[PDB]
Design a protein around this nucleic acid. Structure first.
Ligand SMILES: [Mg+2]
Ligand SMILES: [Mg+2]
Lengths: 258, 468, 468, 258
DNA sequence: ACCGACGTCTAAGAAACCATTAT
DNA sequence: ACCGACGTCTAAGAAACCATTAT
């Protein structure tokens, strides 16, 4: 880059390079469908995936809850070195690492976690709407410098609810890992998003480049807690457990000059 | 968090009458004149009607208000004053005589009430039979479907527009289909400009063309359409080509991929022999329009990726002296951009009031990059000479870039994005500034839909003037 | 008393399909096939019609008779039987469909009645409009001008042929004009041979070419035309270039002499700047068509004499290693030659029964020579293998030679005479054995008339196929 | 020359190299137009031209008829040495030499002299058609060995007349002077040549190499009196006058072998 | 105290027309 | 014993069906 105007993306660089996860070697054969069935029935406090052996991040008591003692043969550790191309080549690793990063991001922090069409959303709670950490986001969605609501009900709707949210995705291009953000208006319940499309269109009608810049900055502040610190924010998944994943994610969005 | 330096491609220039350039198309037509007016072709644009006798006055009203000036009322930042057909195109628009006005049979109303769309299309084409022997007395025909026929327009696997266009393609008579959308719209300038440019193009003329375009280059676009039935589905993949002849002129044609009829495929990707057939057929047109010379470089654009088989077919279908360019256009991506202005006097760096410029491309990796076909463009504004215009502002608060993946190439991104940007404005069917996708893909998709509707018109080369 | 020793050069050989040599064009075409047939370009010759609806019958009749064999009736000594288009050219002649048969508007008859020739040409092109859309579907268009338009054919300062050719040339559409001459002539084989060869040449084919050609030589011919107006006179000068590429080609193009538009000359001889400009354009075209090498030796032919500035420009536009030959062509001379047979058997020295053989050149002085481009040729006669044939026996009882003036050169007359004689046979527009003038001069004359008629098409190089 | 067939031209070599003309010096300046006007009005028995002084061939009584004694300053002599170079360089000298040669050739012989389009023609007289010297030309024009008419009335015209003739021209090439002959059918009156074009075309239609050779030989014999004698024929113009020109022109036409 | 207007004369060709079709 | 039916998962586009019109 050499000159202006500048281009600001929505991609946050990921600096981590290795994940030390654990394996679950079981004598009897396991498939993904029954694995997810057991996860649904038991509700583990951990994330589990299946490439060729059951891979997990969290505490052993969980997988001892999901698997009886006879089924589990031995437990070891897996070194996922060269995370980027492993995520690119293996889809299960991509989804697993994306879930781990999101769960690390949304820990001890008052933002709800939601999924739509197998995509992850960070949605602000109704109860904690007036919290001080959301002042910047309230300012961004405001009109003529006035404070704006960041949660409410949909006009001319029976029981529809709307909230301001951000969609987080994981993307791998050229050996570098990027976290992508996109502001979006989440609707509760999920299956009644048909009834509020006029509302979302009206709310997003005037979110021009300047307002979108402020919204993105406010969401970066909410997600990471610091802005323009010049460094990186360290996030971890289940720090108390043995097998834990730590990540180094920068706070400055990828940009380009002329 | 520092990417490679981006570059912005200057807005491509359009060529008009007397070989003189202007970026804004409607402004160029209003003030300079159409490019084909240099050769006085068409000398006149004779006109023909096909409407039910209950809706004749609508046709007379639309042609009259085409012939009269109209002022913009919506999106006035872009649309300029419309000065009528004669003042803009410098050729008259001749109203049809008594014998050049056609009446559809009354059985069309019954067929529409029965909901059988194919019978409706057949009845319309049979009603227009009286015009075949008088084809010498006119050039472009208008067909009108009133709002009472909405229910026979689009149902499962059927399309009245594509069916009628396929039926009239071999009859060699351009048509322009108008419904109540054109007659019940607030912004009259929108409709008048679009219809006027479309009628002039269907008359055989060239409204405008790219200013700086090389005659040794060819461009190919491949798209596919899906038809589903009880047993399953098959892919109707077609092709299209943009290039200019050795002499001054424009021709834009599309043709089917299927080497023989009744060849069935279940995936969009093309076989080795299929690529050989299609690319050798394209070579035939290129040599025919350039006195048998070889193209020095070829561009192929697809909506899907290229497998090793497709790459080998493309590489073997051309000579060794011609460089081969394969580019996949990914419309929807996870990236968007925000524009930041530099320090201007006292004020520091801050987000711009208008979105990212159109022409900005960001190289992501060795073979993948995003180019902004959507954005703000300067120099086309009418209300405020100094304020840029971003057209998709009424629907999208921010442009969405398209994402380009290369499979073969030695030269840099400059030529590729320059060509892709240049081809975004040459859609005469478009009354706006540009298209999100290059016109090659647009025509490929339209012809794919038409061939999917009617597969009896394969292996016949057809130009844009029949499907715009 | 006695002049210097003369010489005769062999009648030059024409190259045909699979590199076969035949002196007789028509015989070689009927017996071996056209040169481009081995590379099968075009794969087929597709036709289109341009005539009023009352005269389409004559067009289908002439195409039918083109498709059927015919036998010579007049001048049978050199004239061979026509074996049909597909038999002789090994490539079918397709009869055009309903969508490829164009009808001229009724306004043409009124325009002809009112005598406005320019309006007539405009109306013809306006009629042919749709063929611009359909040009992918065919190769060559047949245009018929009825005898009712005779009053607008050629009057003072106007020419319908040149106007129509100039208007359709940028459109890259080769056309053929048919009059009542081709339809009311007793010898049908002449019409058949000429029309078939012209159509094959216009479709992109090479009917024949000289056998032994050096690819390191270029040939240039400059001719001028006279335009009359009230102000005075303007001299339209145009240049024609003949050469062959490195492989399987034949470049026969003409281009204007004017550096800028509206540069008026009152005298045929061009200035130093104009000579440098035109000769450099010739060098650039040869450079483009010869992979970047320069010609070893260059021929320039002109109708009038070379002034000193022209010679200086010719010497300065090329390098030192490339020899340059300047040759004058003079049609009218005071000399004629008589052939006297030698002593054979008992018959003493007596004049021969047939005139002097074509190819005989008489060196007059160190700078002037008389070349017999008209004469008798051996090995061509069909009735009697041993009897010589003289083409213009029904025109000139005796051949009248042309005279050559060398303005610069150290070599002999053999090379220049051979080149000039060989360049007299590749005029594909005629049906006879040879032309009195080299093809460069006649093409430059034709393009001079075209440019003088329409001066708006300058600065574009054009191939022979559009003006034959 | 080394072999046959032979090429026979229309050119007769001229052996003379110098012409002694007379100079008529005018006290008052004179122009070509007035000189021609005086020539037409007086009809002198001499030939005159004007390069820078009036050059004449003929007798002093003639130019004293044209010029009054007051105007004439002095009379002298002029040597045109190297006639070929002077004729090539000077146009008026070329015309004067051509006229002098023609007048010397057509002296004391029954051949009419006519001029058409700046060209010189030798026409056979109508009255003297049956002369014995014309037998060769009559044979050359007839068909299948039959004697043919030389002059007659054109077909289907009021009083148009025709007679067979030869065009005499002078040409300079490379320092050597040649006389050119071209047989051509004269029409009287001159201005009505267009009305008999079909007639001439019919007459010359089969005049192939044989007939052309015979006609050329007959015309050479008629003009010079000898054919192929190996010598030169001497002709003089105005031999009685003081200023006269004599020429040596061979009878054998220039030819080429090899 | 000149280089422009006009006459003569060569050569050479081009433009609105005419006419035949190969001893 | 090899390869053919099903499940999971990414990217990515099109059978379709509603909008609003450029700070
Ligand atoms: Mg359209
Ligand atoms: Mg043409």
């Amino acid at each position: 880059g050499k000159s202006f105007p500048a281009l600001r993306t929505n991609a946050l660089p990921v600096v981590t390079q290795s994940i030390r996860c654990g394996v679950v070697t079981l004598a009897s054969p396991i498939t993904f469908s029954e694995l997810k069935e057991r996860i649904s029935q038991k509700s583990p406090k951990a994330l589990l995936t299946y490439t060729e052996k059951v891979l997990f991040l969290g505490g052993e008591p969980e997988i001892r809850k999901i698997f009886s003692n006879d089924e589990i043969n031995s437990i070891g550790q897996y070194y996922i070195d060269e995370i980027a191309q492993s995520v690119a080549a293996s889809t299960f690793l991509k989804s697993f690492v994306e879930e781990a990063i999101l769960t690390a991001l949304l820990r001890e922090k008052p933002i709800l976690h939601r999924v739509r069409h197998r995509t992850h959303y960070a949605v602000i709670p109704n109860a904690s709407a007036k919290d001080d950490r959301f002042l910047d986001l309230r300012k961004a969605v405001g009109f003529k410098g006035d404070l704006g609501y960041i949660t409410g009900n949909v006009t001319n709707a029976k029981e529809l609810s709307w909230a301001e949210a951000v969609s987080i995705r994981l993307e791998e291009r050229g050996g570098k890992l990027w976290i992508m953000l996109k502001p979006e208006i989440w609707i509760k319940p999920l299956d009644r998003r048909e009834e509020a499309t006029d509302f979302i269109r009206s709310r997003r009608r005037y979110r021009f480049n300047q307002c979108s810049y402020q919204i993105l900055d406010a969401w970066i502040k909410i997600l990471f807690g610091s802005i323009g610190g010049g460094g990186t924010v360290n996030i971890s998944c289940f720090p108390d457990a043995e097998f834990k994943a730590e990540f180094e994610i920068g706070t400055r969005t990828a940009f380009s000059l002329g | 968090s520092q990417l490679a330096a981006h570059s912005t491609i200057p807005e491509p220039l359009l060529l008009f009458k007397d070989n003189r350039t202007d970026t804004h198309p409607l402004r160029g037509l209003s003030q300079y004149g159409p490019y084909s007016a240099c050769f006085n072709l068409p000398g006149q644009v004779r006109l023909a009607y096909l409407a039910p006798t209950e809706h004749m006055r609508k046709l007379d009203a639309i042609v009259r208000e085409l012939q009269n000036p109209a002022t913009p009322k919506e999106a006035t930042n872009y649309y300029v004053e419309y000065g009528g057909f004669e003042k803009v195109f410098k050729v008259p628009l001749v109203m049809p005589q008594e014998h050049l006005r056609c009446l559809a049979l009354d059985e069309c109303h019954g067929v529409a009430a029965n909901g059988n769309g194919l019978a409706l299309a057949d009845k319309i084409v049979q009603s227009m039979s009286g015009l075949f022997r008088q084809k010498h007395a006119f050039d472009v025909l208008l067909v009108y479907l009133p709002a009472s026929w909405k229910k026979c327009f689009e149902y499962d696997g059927f399309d009245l527009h594509d069916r009628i266009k396929a039926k009239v393609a071999p009859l060699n008579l351009p048509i322009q289909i108008i419904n109540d959308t054109a007659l019940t719209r607030q912004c009259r300038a929108n409709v008048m400009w679009g219809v006027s440019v479309a009628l002039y193009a269907k008359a055989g003329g060239i409204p405008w063309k790219l200013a700086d375009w090389d005659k040794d280059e060819a461009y190919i676009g491949l798209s596919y359409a899906i038809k589903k039935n009880a047993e399953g589905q098959e892919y109707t993949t077609c092709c299209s080509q943009v290039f200019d002849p050795d002499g001054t002129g424009f021709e834009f044609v599309a043709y089917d991929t299927r080497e023989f009829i009744t060849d069935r495929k279940g995936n969009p990707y093309l076989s080795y022999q299929e690529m050989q057939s299609v690319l050798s057929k394209s070579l035939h047109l290129y040599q025919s329009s350039h006195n048998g010379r070889m193209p020095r470089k070829i561009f192929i654009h697809k909506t899907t990726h290229f497998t090793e088989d497709e790459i080998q077919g493309a590489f073997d279908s051309f000579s060794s002296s011609t460089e081969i360019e394969l580019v996949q256009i990914i419309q929807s991506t996870n990236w968007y951009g925000l524009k930041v202005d530099g320090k201007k006097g006292d004020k520091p760096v801050a987000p711009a009031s208008y979105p990212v410029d159109r022409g900005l491309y960001q190289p992501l990796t060795e073979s993948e990059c995003l180019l902004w076909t959507q954005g703000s463009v300067m120099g086309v504004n009418q209300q405020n000479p100094g304020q840029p215009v971003f057209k998709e502002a009424a629907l999208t608060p921010l442009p969405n870039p398209i994402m380009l993946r290369r499979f073969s190439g030695n030269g840099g991104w400059h030529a590729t994005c320059s060509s892709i940007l240049a081809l975004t404005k040459v859609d005469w069917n478009n009354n706006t500034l540009y298209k999100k996708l290059p016109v090659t893909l647009v025509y490929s998709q339209v012809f794919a839909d038409v061939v999917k509707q009617t597969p009896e018109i394969v292996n016949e080369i057809y130009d844009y003037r029949f499907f715009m």
